Design a protein around this ligand. Sequence first.
Ligand code: ADX
Ligand code: ADX
Ligand code: CL
Ligand code: CL
Ligand code: CL
Ligand code: CL
Ligand code: CL
Ligand code: NA
Ligand code: NA
Ligand code: NA
Ligand code: NA
Ligand code: ZN
Ligand code: ZN
Lengths: 346, 343
Amino acid sequence: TLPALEIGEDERLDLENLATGAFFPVKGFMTREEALSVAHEMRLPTGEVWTIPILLQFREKPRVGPGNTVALLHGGERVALLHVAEAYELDLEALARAVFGTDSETHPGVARLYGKGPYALAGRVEVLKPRPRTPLEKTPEEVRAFFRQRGWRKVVAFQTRNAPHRAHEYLIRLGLELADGVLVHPILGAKKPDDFPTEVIVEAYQALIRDFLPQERVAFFGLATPMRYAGPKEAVFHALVRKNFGATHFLVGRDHAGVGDFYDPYAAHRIFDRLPPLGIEIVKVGAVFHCPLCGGIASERTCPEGHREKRTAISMTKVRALLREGKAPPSELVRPELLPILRRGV
Amino acid sequence: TLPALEIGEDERLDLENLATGAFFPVKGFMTREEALSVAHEMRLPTGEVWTIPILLQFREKPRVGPGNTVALLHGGERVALLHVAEAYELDLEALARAVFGTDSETHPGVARLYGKGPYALAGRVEVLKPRPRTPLEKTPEEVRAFFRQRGWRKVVAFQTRNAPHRAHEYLIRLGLELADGVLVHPILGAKKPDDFPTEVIVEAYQALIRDFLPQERVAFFGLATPMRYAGPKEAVFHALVRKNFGATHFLVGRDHAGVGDFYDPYAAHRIFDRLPPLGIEIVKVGAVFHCPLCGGIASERTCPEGHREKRTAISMTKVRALLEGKAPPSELVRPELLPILRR
Ligand SMILES: Nc1ncnc2c1ncn2[C@@H]1O[C@H](COP(=O)(O)OS(=O)(=O)O)[C@@H](O)[C@H]1O
Ligand SMILES: Nc1ncnc2c1ncn2[C@@H]1O[C@H](COP(=O)(O)OS(=O)(=O)O)[C@@H](O)[C@H]1O
Ligand SMILES: [Cl-]
Ligand SMILES: [Cl-]
Ligand SMILES: [Cl-]
Ligand SMILES: [Cl-]
Ligand SMILES: [Cl-]
Ligand code: NA
Ligand code: NA
Ligand code: NA
Ligand code: NA
Ligand SMILES: [Zn+2]
Ligand SMILES: [Zn+2]
């Protein structure tokens, strides 16, 4: 029998994203050269833009090498086949600094990386036992087909790892105003502890879409891959992957993909300035909040400096704090109708 | 002394717009082939896209002809020189049906056209006595400079002929999210009776901009030309002109440059689909209204069909004709702007 190696969920999700073209142009778990150039130069050796290393890691060096075909185990059964193209070890700390901007294990993304081990295997993979998908978890080809069918030419994608608050909804509405349709694409893979569980994200968005948005033009599908919380660099990753799903536009608000306040609020806007056109337009929007003077939800690009004093910040951190405290998040933060859904997963 | 011809206010304004490049590629008052190609095939004979015929009309055929230099007179002096390159007569009715989509004198646009005379002259123009322009009445070149002065590379232009209402501000808001800056370019030329006077809109806007908008990123200048109310075609006109003022984007809402219910609310939207890339991006936005369920001013593209029966349409007509001593609801007009709307 073939040499076998157990693999976690992050791995099973990402080998599938590789095989489905979600991570195109990356086609297989990266070689050391690929990992390093991606991490330090934001390019693949061949020249294409890419910022997030896709790796198959292990805590103990595997008993396999170039040319071997290995069975990948998950959930007890053999799920896929790996065509090892290289076996190497990485200096995770150096890698984390380049990808996350810090090597502190206090960073959730950094911790997840370290936990997987320094031994890596590169190579293409073939899916044997596809993981069961729900109607929401559509493949890039299924999404692009969905767009063609409905005749959507201009499509703005919206990334998210949380339940929606009024600020998130503003981005979605901005998208609705500029495109034939908007793709709300929640991350379905592993997240840090204080993010809302996928089940409440799914119920919250379906309610927001069903009762407050044109159901007609809001495609709600899920992207199954972990959050890296790498801010600016993850933003580029998010945009590129959405491009593979058929999006022509990608929203990037305040502190896109950040953890706490480690990255500068708009570094994810700026990073695109230091990169070549990507084949998908970036729609940047500043901080979104509530303004009594303006008369409701607004942003820094539409609200006068003189209004500051009266602005009310909108963030899920505040929202969860309010809920964990027994208090009810105000109407200017979250919609009252979604509250029961949120209290349920806090 | 050279031949003298009198000209109306409208004429004085466009002759300058022609010289300031505000109507590029339109050089000077077009010929007969030019007037027909534009009005029927939305193109200059050359090939450039253009929809509104720029004409110098007279109720009585001028005694001048090709090759002649004519002196134009506005008040009581020689405002500019005209190099007549052709003289002719036009079938105003057949010209109107093409331009405004009708020839019914009930149309504020066809009317003004008729009262100008079926006789017209063509040819380049040279200004000799530039009419006094306030700080707002900036020329195309003066506006392009104002943009580089602030480094605005992406500019969204907004066309308006009335006072600011919530739906108007909405479109300006949208522009502020898409570009480094937004150009609010009110029409300073002649408008029909019901449209708010330049004076009031000018004072209402800078009050809005000052107390409710990024004072720093909202350019408020006026375009000195008359309103044609040509609906869709005037929309293309507005687009191309604002392009010359340096805007990269142009906003077009519901029933843009329309009158009563003459044109289909979205005709000014579809017309761009039948034209080639203009060199300026058209930002289409549907009906804008108030919605309690959405929680404020939303649009046909952001408010679901199921909220319809709760929407509160926004129109400057109702407002204007409602101070009947009434008071426009907050969800349609900013209260802080009534003292200006009333006066
Ligand atoms: N208050 C806010 N103002 C503006 N943009 C925001 C705000 N909160 C979140 N966003 C943006 O909206 C999307 C929502 O992201 P979240 O789900 O909160 O977290 S993230 O990891 O996907 O960025 C991202 O583009 C993010 O930058
Ligand atoms: N209620 C509304 N909903 C959507 N767009 C609107 C609304 N009112 C005005 N607009 C649009 O905003 C601009 C304001 O136009 P108006 O001054 O009312 O008339 S126009 O003659 O200049 O077009 C135009 O782009 C117009 O189509
Ligand atoms: Cl329903
Ligand atoms: Cl965030
Ligand atoms: Cl956080
Ligand atoms: Cl960088
Ligand atoms: Cl709203
Ligand atoms: Na380490
Ligand atoms: Na940290
Ligand atoms: Na007539
Ligand atoms: Na519908
Ligand atoms: Zn404000
Ligand atoms: Zn609504």
